[PDB]
Amino acid sequence: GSHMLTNLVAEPFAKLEQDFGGSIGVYAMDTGSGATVSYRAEERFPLCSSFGFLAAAVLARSQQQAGLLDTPIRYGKNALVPWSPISEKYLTTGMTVAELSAAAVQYSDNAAANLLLKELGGPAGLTAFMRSIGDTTFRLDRWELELNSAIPGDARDTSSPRAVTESLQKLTLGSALAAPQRQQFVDWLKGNTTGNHRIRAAVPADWAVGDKTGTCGVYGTANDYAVVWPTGRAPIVLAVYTRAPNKDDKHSEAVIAAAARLALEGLGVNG
Numbered sequence: 398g399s400h401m402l403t404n405l406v407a408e409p410f411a412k413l414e415q416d417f418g419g420s421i422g423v424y425a426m427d428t429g430s431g432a433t434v435s436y437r438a439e440e441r442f443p444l445c446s447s448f449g450f451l452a453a454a455v456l457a458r459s460q461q462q463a464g465l466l467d468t469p470i471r472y473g474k475n476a477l478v479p480w481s482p483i484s485e486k487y488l489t490t491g492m493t494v495a496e497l498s499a500a501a502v503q504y505s506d507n508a509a510a511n512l513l514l515k516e517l518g519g520p521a522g523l524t525a526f527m528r529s530i531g532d533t534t535f536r537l538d539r540w541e542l543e544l545n546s547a548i549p550g551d552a553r554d555t556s557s558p559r560a561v562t563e564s565l566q567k568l569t570l571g572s573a574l575a576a577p578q579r580q581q582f583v584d585w586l587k588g589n590t591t592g593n594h595r596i597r598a599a600v601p602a603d604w605a606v607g608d609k610t611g612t613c614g615v616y617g618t619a620n621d622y623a624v625v626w627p628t629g630r631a632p633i634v635l636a637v638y639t640r641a642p643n644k645d646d647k648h649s650e651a652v653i654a655a656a657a658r659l660a661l662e663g664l665g666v667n668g
């Protein structure tokens with residue numbers, strides 16, 4: 398018992414990560430049942446772009462400092478880093494802190510994320526925020542885009558699927574954020590545009606989904622974490638993280654979607 402759901406899907410998960418050629422880490426909790434499914438859920442995986450939590454940290458700080466979200470941020474061309482499809486459209490005008498947050502969550506805007514990182518004190522500030530809500534696993538160490546190196550055995554810029562899921566639940570469903578900020582965090586995740594082929598591809602069409610993706614681009618390392626609401630039922634929080642032994646190994650969005658389905662199938666809902 399207790400771990401019965403985990404062992405329900407243990408063999409299919411191992412088969413899926415064998416076909417993938419790497420490791421798959423999954424954690425998922427049914428916030429109604431308390432039921433959990435675990436597969437490599439306590440192992441470290443590169444966060445890549447999934448380091449969503451930056452936007453939550455910004456929302457938490459805005460509770461202490463009035464007008465933070467509306468503050469305009471002006472930046473030069475040197476602040477632009479590759480793959481900033483939003484912030485490069487506003488180089489000559491600037492953006493507000495909330496707009497930088499929405500761009501970081503919904504488009505993985507790299508220049509927006511680095512600007513918000515400096516606002517909070519760098520990677521140590523974001524790590525400090527995660528400690529304040531009880532996450533002792535998360536660590537951010539570098540900036541975009543150095544945090545994507547995803548080196549085997551390197552604990553820098555990693556966390557675990559379980560801690561990610563536990564942190565996501567405190568921020569979206571618990572009381573780590575005040576009620577207006579919690580709903581705002583939820584709204585930013587709901588409007589994400591990069592996760593259509595991952596967790597979203599694994600849920601029924603009528604489910605509401607908020608997610609944040611990550612893609613390091615090397616070592617077959619990609620991920621996705623989400624809160625999903627079955628129609629009329631308690632929400633589910635889940636995190637799917639992958640990695641692979643070789644730098645040239647390619648990630649698979651299908652593998653992430655397939656792992657999310659297995660986790661949902663183990664919990665008791667249809668995947």
Ligand SMILES: CC(C)(C)OC(=O)N[C@@]1(C(=O)Nc2nnn[nH]2)CN(C(=O)c2cccc(C(F)(F)F)c2)c2ccccc21
Pocket residue numbers: 446447480505507541542545591609610611612613614615647648
């Ligand atoms: C369009 C493209 C697919 C290039 O993605 C990006 O535009 N930029 C990234 C991204 O979307 N971030 C993300 N994605 N999901 N969530 N956040 C994606 N990326 C990659 O290195 C990447 C993505 C796909 C394939 C490859 C490969 F050919 F090398 F394998 C590398 C990256 C790295 C660091 C920072 C940001 C990114």
